[PDB]
Antibody, heavy 220, light 219 residues
Framework: EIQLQQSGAELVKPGASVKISCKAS????????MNWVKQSHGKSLEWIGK????????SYNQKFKGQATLTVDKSSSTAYMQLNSLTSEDSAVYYC?????????????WGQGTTLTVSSAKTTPPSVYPLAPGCGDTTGSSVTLGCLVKGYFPESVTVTWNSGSLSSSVHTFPALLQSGLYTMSSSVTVPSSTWPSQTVTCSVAHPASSTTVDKKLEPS | NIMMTQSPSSLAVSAGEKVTMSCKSS????????????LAWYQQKPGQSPKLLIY???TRESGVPDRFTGSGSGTDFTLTISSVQAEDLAVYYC????????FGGGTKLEIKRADAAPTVSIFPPSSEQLTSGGASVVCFLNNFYPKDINVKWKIDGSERQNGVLNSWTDQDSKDSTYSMSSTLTLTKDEYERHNSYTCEATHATSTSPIVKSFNRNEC
């Protein structure tokens, strides 16, 4: 099965450069063009450029020609996109995508995307608050718990619920940006027969700030 | 160059309805020498990368369900879903690769379903946050339809919509519902000078809300 594995989210400052990678597997790396595509939040897809891995030959969208450099390493079957002189308008999700040269060049397999944030805002760890029902509350056959993850930057963050051997329903609420800081929340629902008896923990990883916090939900 | 125009920008239909979306190119994408149309269609689901559905205008990519059909030639193309399923919510993009590579602006497909009331849960500020001088009051409204629900906060029986942060999930790919979080941001002082806190959820359609309340003075 073909996989295009891209590097993790990056935060860089205006004027700086970034280099995003795309490691190919499951097909002949040298046989197919590698393309790069920008998607701004709002969602128009724009082609940036392509590289022919065998020759190292490249072709660019003139809108990106001057700031983008495409390269490959055919010892690791990895394609690279370096973007220089970055600005906030470059904040977007970037994809690599395999092209089908001998069928005219449509894109057939895409990487998972890499989120780029261009900003002078500072990397900041989250505060994590467990959300348990109040003492005045009651619950039916199910109970809902939550985790509020507040005041972090940049956006890359993972909230993981561990409910042990319980089956659960999770909702993850998209982050909102305020004052250069993100806030998000997540809910988990388990049977009322099982909490607080069984441990339910919210695990928050924010790689940028080297933060990993785990908060056990406790009855109020 | 070659510009791609898609219509409609968005549409909502119930599962089981047929949908036709269009893609127009500003120049022909029919390659003279092989008489193939260099036109592809992609599906991009929430949180995911685009996936190839159709290439050469009408050829279904391996693995793609038969309900997706691409048609057209020259400048005029359509993608049809014969019978929409819940999992088909996505943005659909057309793409040409005859002269450079360009994309359409996308058609966002949403699913209609029967109205569903939210399961509502309210959470007092934790003592952890309170000791730190903040007070966020959180309310979850889970698994409801339609999207445009009203959430109102009442403090001591009177409304405040000042300082409310609302975040909706993307539509659920299995049951077609939405969920949302509503957070009421207060200073500790603001929080401590009132007692009853209520989150109310109402469909725009009716006047029968679902309410969840707590009292600060209790526990």
């Amino acid at each position: 099965e073909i996989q295009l594995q891209q590097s993790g989210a990056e935060l860089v400052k205006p004027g700086a450069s970034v280099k995003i990678s795309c490691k190919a597997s499951g097909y002949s790396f040298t046989g197919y063009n590698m393309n790069w595509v920008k998607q701004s939040h709002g969602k128009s897809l724009e082609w940036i450029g392509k590289i022919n891995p065998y020759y190292g030959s490249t072709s660019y969208n003139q809108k990106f020609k001057g700031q983008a450099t495409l390269t490959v390493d055919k010892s690791s079957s990895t394609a690279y996109m370096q973007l220089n002189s970055l600005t906030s308008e470059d904040s977007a999700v970037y994809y690599c995508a395999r092209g089908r040269l001998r069928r005219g060049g449509y894109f057939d397999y895409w990487g998972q995307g890499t989120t780029l944030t261009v900003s002078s805002a500072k990397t900041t760890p989250p505060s994590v608050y467990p959300l348990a029902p109040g003492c005045g509350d009651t619950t039916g056959s199910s109970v809902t718990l939550g985790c509020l993850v507040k005041g972090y930057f940049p956006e890359s963050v993972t909230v993981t619920w561990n409910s042990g051997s319980l089956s659960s329903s999770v909702h993850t609420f998209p982050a909102l940006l305020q004052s250069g800081l993100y806030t998000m929340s997540s809910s988990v629902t388990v049977p009322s027969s099982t909490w607080p008896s069984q441990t339910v923990t919210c695990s928050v990883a924010h790689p940028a700030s080297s933060t990993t916090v785990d908060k056990k939900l406790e009855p109020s | 160059n070659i510009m791609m125009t898609q219509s409609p920008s968005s549409l909502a239909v119930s599962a089981g309805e047929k949908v036709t979306m269009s893609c127009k190119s500003s120049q022909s994408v029919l390659y003279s020498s092989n008489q193939k149309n260099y036109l592809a269609w992609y599906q991009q689901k929430p949180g995911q990368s685009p996936k190839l559905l159709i290439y050469w205008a009408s050829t279904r990519e391996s693995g793609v369900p038969d309900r997706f059909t691409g048609s057209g030639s020259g400048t005029d193309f359509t993608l049809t879903i014969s019978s929409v399923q819940a999992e088909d919510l996505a943005v659909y993009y057309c793409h040409q690769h005859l002269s450079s590579w360009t994309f359409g602006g996308g058609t966002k497909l949403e699913i209609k379903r029967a109205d569903a009331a939210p399961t509502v849960s309210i959470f007092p500020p934790s003592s952890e946050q309170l000791t730190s001088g903040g007070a966020s009051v959180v309310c979850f409204l889970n698994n409801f339809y339609p999207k445009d629900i009203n959430v109102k906060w009442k403090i001591d029986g009177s409304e405040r919509q000042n300082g409310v942060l609302n975040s909706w999930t993307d539509q659920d790919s299995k049951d077609s519902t939405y969920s949302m979080s509503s957070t009421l941001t207060l200073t500790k002082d603001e929080y401590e000078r009132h007692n009853s806190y209520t989150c109310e959820a109402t469909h725009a359609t009716s006047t029968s809300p679902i309410v969840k309340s707590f009292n600060r003075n209790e526990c």
